[PDB]
Symmetry: D2
Subunit: 340 residues, 4 copies
């Protein structure tokens, strides 16, 4: 009813227990260490809440403009929360390595790997278990409800899977209707044929050859999308994650983004990329903080494996919407884009 009761500050503000204080040798910065983590976990709970609601709205045959606006609003909110979480790292960096050394021994069985909510965010966004650098990540959890939650987050459709189903059903790709993919192939042939005819008229012979070489590079780019087998091979080696039809829809969305009907679906894709990039930015800032606190290896780490694992999470293997970042590779000028 009143402020403190509505926010349950009785419970919230009685969850801070400094172990160095319990051992009668308090380290002032352990309080900051606890509060920073607790602020991360409150926001992880909010991100999970937003993600689950967006997954429910995406797990439907009909995705109208009203629901699309609501998804864009909540993805944008997650982007703001992730920027705030990236800014929480310089606050914990204000703790000196020597002060952290005076209480890190009490952490002992605790590990960053034991954050159930961080794993739930990764899985709900779409981090594939097979693409993780590897004890299996889920083995760290001994609690049955924690194991159940992890297992459910892996088997339930992730934002990656749901966004792909939505992209596959993009109105415009329909061969009976607008038939975008076929028109796009013809536009590429017409555009590239004109580029070859224009390259021949070049005065300097070195400039004529550079353009003919460049046009061949373009043809190889278009073979990677117009030949389903070349796309499938790229998917197999981890270079792509999207189904061939989801990729077609994402490309069409980027081509018509200035059109009122395609502007919000394009904003939805942009925010997915921003979320992906912000998670990587948190990963990078976290490794820099780990290195400034305890170096690449310290007493208690048993070598540099922990640090090296953290550095390997910065690879494109942990990027969920990897395909979205490369879509501008397939773009042709406005004059060559098939008219709506």
């Amino acid at each position: 009813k009143i402020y403190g009761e509505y926010l349950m500050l009785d419970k919230l503000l009685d969850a801070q227990c400094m172990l160095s204080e319990e051992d009668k040798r308090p380290v002032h910065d352990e309080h900051l260490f606890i509060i920073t983590h607790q602020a991360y976990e409150l926001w992880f709970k909010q991100i999970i809440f937003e993600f689950d609601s967006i997954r429910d709205m995406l797990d439907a045959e009909v995705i109208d403009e009203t629901k699309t606006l609501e998804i864009v609003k909540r993805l944008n909110r997650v982007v703001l929360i992730l920027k705030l979480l990236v800014d929480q790292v310089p606050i914990l960096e204000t703790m000196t390595p020597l002060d952290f050394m005076d209480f890190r021994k009490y952490l002992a069985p605790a590990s960053g790997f034991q954050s159930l909510q961080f794993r739930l965010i990764e899985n709900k966004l779409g981090v594939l278990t097979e693409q993780r650098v590897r004890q299996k990540y889920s083995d760290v959890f001994s609690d049955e409800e924690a194991r159940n939650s992890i297992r459910n987050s892996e088997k339930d459709p992730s934002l990656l899977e749901l966004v792909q189903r939505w992209l596959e059903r993009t109105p415009g790709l329909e061969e009976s209707g607008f038939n975008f993919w076929a028109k796009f192939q013809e536009s590429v042939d017409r555009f590239l044929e004109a580029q070859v005819q224009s390259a021949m008229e070049e005065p300097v012979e070195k400039a004529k050859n550079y353009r003919l070489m460049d046009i061949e590079k373009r043809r190889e780019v278009y073979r990677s999308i117009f030949d389903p087998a070349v796309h499938d091979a790229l998917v197999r080696r981890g270079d792509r994650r999207f189904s061939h039809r989801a990729l077609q829809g994402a490309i069409m969305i980027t081509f018509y983004r200035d059109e009122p009907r395609f502007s919000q679906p394009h904003q939805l894709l942009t925010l997915l990329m921003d979320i992906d990039s912000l998670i990587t930015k948190w990963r990078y800032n976290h490794v820099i903080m780990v290195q400034r606190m305890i170096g690449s290896q310290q007493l208690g780490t048993g070598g540099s494996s922990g640090y090296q694992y953290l550095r390997s999470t910065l690879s494109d293997r942990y990027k969920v919407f990897l395909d979205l970042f490369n879509l501008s590779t397939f773009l042709i000028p406005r004059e060559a884009i098939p008219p709506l």
Copy 2:
């Protein structure tokens, strides 16, 4: 002693209770409303923790260079936390006024005035109870709990950061009349500097330019009378224009004059961070009023008029600025050539 147990996530993550969900009409954004406030309250607890530790270090006769560096580190930490809290406002602003309307009726007896930690931060920094804008109810009357009232009473009576910083400034080495005797040398430097300015102003060819400089030199003399005449300083303190004791103000001025000197650089950084904290609390106040206005306007159903909004706008005044004196110290500055040279 695993991650979840060490951080007591059993307790921390079971403190979210949506009242709209309890009334069988859940509003999705109520969860954001609760989480945002809980993140503010966790950081308020950290700011209180840092403030209390800084107050203990300042409540001592001996404030060495090692303790000064530690105070500067923790004040800088509070600055970073306050910038983060200012950035939490745009997150809550993603909630639309219509969605907030569907759960604000459950808030009913709850009020932002009931945040004990926010009041504790204000009092521990140094907001005087007499300088608060009041339309009816005293700020402490909002708390019915005896331990909350006791905490508020203790934060008012215990020395604030404002009081403790003043005692530290009064004991500034350099002000000692037996030693460096800064205040007297400063007065002589002002006379020598201003007398030279008058002699230079007389040589001006244009009469309009000669008069502007003589008028400006008189403005300077009035500025220096406000600090060299203790009675003029005392009157400014009485009308709320100043908060510092005359000797604390002398110390603060001396610190700004010699900030480039190794011995005065950390004490100047300590003062700069107090100003930054003051300024950041005002920035949070401004962003909060903008958000309040965009959510419920200047008045809405349930507010009984515009007094809440008008009260929030009045907290943006210099009445709520704690280290008000620090912001105006450059008014008393003279050029490097005129500053009394340090011996050692």
Copy 3:
């Protein structure tokens, strides 16, 4: 053709002239003072360029969804540029007051009042000359092309005037069509009548009276918008700037913002408010910097009039879209809003 030539760095990077260096007594921070101002002026030129293009798109009878998206994009860009300009103040604050004192004497005839581009931004956004705290601001400019530019920025329709014409023509306000204003008045009567009937059933008599008192406060709020004469009086005393019909359109936009047809026009209004608030935030950060460099008064200022003028620019007199900030005062719950 090459990088330096395309960006005219020959010209751009030969515009830095330290007067303290010319007088054989260089002050290192004068370089920062010049560069900071020059970076402000480059971005002021960009803001003016964006504003003029938005004014051209708004000065048309037909404002379609395609043009609305483009205006929202460029207003958002101006918001990002203004946040960057606010962040340039802490960079100049790194210069100590004593170092600024060693070169401020060379500034002499130069004044912040002589920034033609800052005045052009204020006028193009919509700062009324009559609402300025006052030598007239335009008297500071002796150059004929500068005076012409200022005069043109005052007489040409500002973003404030153009946004109002666009709001007046809002489809939905048409008495022949949707007729929003009349339906809104009826909804307010029905909603408030129900609030009175519900207030009577209250168990505590003190709670019943608070609600009846609150309902009367609501009726006085609605009289300020449903009685054109009360709106006109508020406009006369500077409390409002919008025409009665522009205000009706802005209110309707906020009520239906979740609807696909009203989402971009609402984003346009939100960005106008963000721009207004960011200009005020720059004004506040600028006065704080002025005070930390030269106090409320210093040698050369002839008293505190300069500082006091800067503090008076922080008032609602300099806020252009003042009306937009108070629109939530008129809101009724979703169930009471007239259905589209």
Copy 4:
């Protein structure tokens, strides 16, 4: 000497020439493209100015506390400018790929490689020419102008901030074998500390726990061999893992151990700011590659394949990090109780 004349806005504001406008097909966003780059180049000139002044202060036998404070102030200023430059990327990202396509063809001979000031910042900070990733053309070959080539050559041969910081670290008071003799005391402290760790590990009841601790103590001994055996340090320097001389590394380690001490706090802040600058240049590199990829993908018409994109991705490696050694100093830290006590 009015505002516009003092800032030479006649010159500054007549440097914007849209090539799409010259070809009678203007693209509105080309103006943003030019202005953004011109704002970067103004700030690059400021960073170069600050760097050159810091290099002059560091190129001296006597580096007093007054000059150290001034270096810390200007390095902090460069940090703020770099954070602002990182924030200029989202502004240019508001330009759509299709609009950039309508004017990118006019850019033709222009290249980001032709920014002389960006190369000057890299070289003055300390990026070694041998550590650069090269696919064909040397980075300096991109410049046809003799004065540009001369500037690049001078920035490579003149002592960089990396070289100057190392000379300053070598002369660290405390390393002197006649005086405090830190390095030898540190080696003894490591032996005493590790020997006690071995004796404590033997008392463990569980055999698996006793072995983990003995394995960990061996990892520590290998870490200390990498710094106490000059040949192991020299091999790491040869393979690019380290850049510092063995004595510069000793000084940097000593500074981190005593950072809480008044005499070591500003030298530690100097090192922290060098790391922050290094890190912020990498953050700009990352944001720039993301923007390049969102505008023109990994390859587009006119790029002749993906070599440009692939080169930009390779600049994110530790090969381009100048003060690489500073980031790993906490690997050598021992607890406070084991750190050799300072005499004076």
